[PDB]
Amino acid sequence: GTRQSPINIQWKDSVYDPQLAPLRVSYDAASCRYLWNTGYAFQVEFDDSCEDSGISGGPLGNHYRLKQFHFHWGATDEWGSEHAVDGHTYPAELHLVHWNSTKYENCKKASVGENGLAVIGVFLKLGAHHQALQKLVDVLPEVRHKDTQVAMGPFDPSCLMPACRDYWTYPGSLTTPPLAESVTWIVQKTPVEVSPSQLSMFRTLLFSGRGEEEDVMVNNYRPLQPLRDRKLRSSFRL
């Protein structure tokens, strides 16, 4: 593929696009359903029945419905994020996945189709405790094994995003099989602070299933891929 993700977001390749319309983010917290261990990461699933929960504007042709969000992290605080910024890797990265409900019938089909997905990437860095994230951390002990799940109460994913919403956008792909190049990436420039214990709890999950030899879930990120001739745009002046 020539549009693979993640990438090292570099100043030299960035071009400011002042024409980008305001990115509108509005989720229905009441649509949250459960959290589960996918065998690769932990993920929060939503009921994407309504079309009033997701994002629009920015580099998107229309509204994309929120389906789920998940995290990627490392064995220690020194690495873990998928994308890098001018060579710098963060301890973890949050991915909010939305699908094109205008061009596609459902997430599944949109996930492998052109312009099927819009994924927001958020970097997590060490700092102050993050209250919203803690609601998720609290139940991680319930989903240690692969495929296990736990019910979720309402949860607004916007609470996991930085106040400053500057972002970079580029056409990319999924970072897990089938690695389809169906994603319009929106990577937030401003990392979000989380306490040391929150990242430590991420590392208590397992890749392995119940009754199997424990295989610790860490370093669940894909290595950096070349930008190639892709257009990397910034929503903010460089």
Question: Using the rule CB under 5 A, is 146 a contact of Zn ion?
Answer: no
Q: Which of K ion, Zn ion, none sits in contact with 147, Cβ below 5 to 8 A by type?
A: K ion
- Report the DSSP beta bridge partners of residue 170: 185
Task: Tell me whether residue 95 is annotated as binding.
Answer: yes
Distance CA 31, CA 9 (A): 33
What span, in angstroms and rounded, lies between the C-alpha atoms of 186 and 170?
A: 7
Nearer to Zn ion, 132 or 179 (CB): 179
Sign of the alpha-carbon torsion through 201, 206, 209, 212: negative
Does the annotation place 72 within a ligand binding site? yes
Which of K ion, Zn ion, none interacts with 95 (beta carbon under 5 to 8 A by kind)?
Zn ion
**Count helices and strands in the chain by DSSP H and E runs:** 3, 15
Residue 149 near which of K ion, Zn ion, none (CB within 5-8 Å, type-dependent):
K ion
**Do 7 and 231 touch, CB atoms closer than 8 A?**
no
Task: Please report whether residue 95 would count as binding Zn ion according to CB under 5 A.
Answer: yes
139 versus 179: smaller Cβ distance to K ion: 139
We find the least distance from the C-beta atom of residue 92 to Zn ion, in angstroms, to be 11
Stretch that binds K ion, among 16-24, 74-82, 117-125, 149-157 (CB under 5 A): 149-157
Residue of the chain from 147, 212, 214, 215 that contacts K ion (CB under 5 A): 147
Buried b (16+ CB within 10 A) or exposed e, 3-42: bbbbbbbeeebbeebeebeebebebbeebbbebbbbbebb
Asked if 151 is part of the footprint of K ion (rule: CB under 5 A), the reply reads no
By CB under 5 A, name the binding residues for K ion.
147, 149
By CB under 5 A, name the binding residues for Zn ion.
95
Q: Binding site: what residues are annotated?
A: 70, 72, 95
